[PDB]
Amino acid sequence: EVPRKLLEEWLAMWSGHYQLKDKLRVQLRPQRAGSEVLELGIHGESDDKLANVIFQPIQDRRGRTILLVRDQNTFGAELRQKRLMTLIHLWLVHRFKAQAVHYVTPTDDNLYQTSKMKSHGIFTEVNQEVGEIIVAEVNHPRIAELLTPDRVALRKLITKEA
Numbered sequence: 345e346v347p348r349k350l351l352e353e354w355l356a357m358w359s360g361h362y363q364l365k366d367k368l369r370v371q372l373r374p375q376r377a378g379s380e381v382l383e384l385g386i387h388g389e390s391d392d393k394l395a396n397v398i399f400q401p402i403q404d405r406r407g408r409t410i411l412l413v414r415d416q417n418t419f420g421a422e423l424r425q426k427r428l429m430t431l432i433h434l435w436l437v438h439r440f441k442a443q444a445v446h447y448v449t450p451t452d453d454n455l456y457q458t459s460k461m462k463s464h465g466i467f468t469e470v471n472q473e474v475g476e477i478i479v480a481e482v483n484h485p486r487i488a489e490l491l492t493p494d495r496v497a498l499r500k501l502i503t504k505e506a
Contacts, residue, residue, distance in 0.1 A: 346439040348372060354431050355386070357495075358502050362426050365389065370435075381414065384432060386423075394420040397432055401440045408443045411436060415449075416457060427501060429457050430464045434490055437466065437482055447478040454478060464501065466490075 348370040355368040367389040375383040375398055386395040398415040416432075418424045433445065447454045450472060458478050462470045465486035473479050489497045500506035 346435070350438075351431065351435040354435070354498065354502075357499065358426065358428070358431060361502050364422060368394070384436065386428075386432070388420075392420075394418075394423055395428060395432065397429075397436065399436070401442070409440050411440060411442045411445045413445060413447045413454075416454065427464065427504070430461050430466060430501065433461055434466055434487065437487055438491060443482055445480045445482070447480070450476050450478050 351370045352368065355370070356366065358364075359366055359368055365388060369387045371383075371385045371387060373383060373385075375381045381398060381400045384397045384399070385393050388394050395418045396416065397413060399411050399413040402410055402412055404410060416429060418428055436442065437445070445458075445467070447458060455478065458467070458470045458480050461467055462480065465483055467480040468483045470478060470480045490501060492498075497506065
């Protein structure tokens with residue numbers, strides 16, 4: 345069972361490294377009442393939503409989980425260019441045991457983020473497919489490396505050493 349607290353621990357190291365304010369909190373709820381679409385939100389001490397991912401975990405015929413991402417944002421400008429969305433996706437992939445992440449709209453920002461996350465290693469392959477969607481296959485060995493309890497690889501991701 346993968347708690348929100350794990351991402352909060354990562355974000356504590358990250359916020360500290362980048363000399364940002366502390367107390368980033370993780371919320372994961374249905375995006376609206378009764379929905380199976382979820383929203384992961386990152387909130388600051390005054391509850392402002394500083395980043396989010398709106399997505400739905402689904403399964404294919406073979407029982408594999410895909411995260412279908414409707415929207416992602418880094419709202420707070422000071423939080424950008426620091427691999428925040430990589431950390432969020434690392435957590436989401438682990439939480440849902442995802443095999444792939446599909447982005448339903450190929451916006452410039454979604455193309456940017458998927459390409460960048462591939463360069464961080466969390467995806468092996470990123471391509472646009474029929475329907476214009478972006479399909480990103482999870483790099484299971486890299487995910488496992490980053491989740492190692494010693495947090496060495498994870499700290500190096502945070503600082504941009506690796």
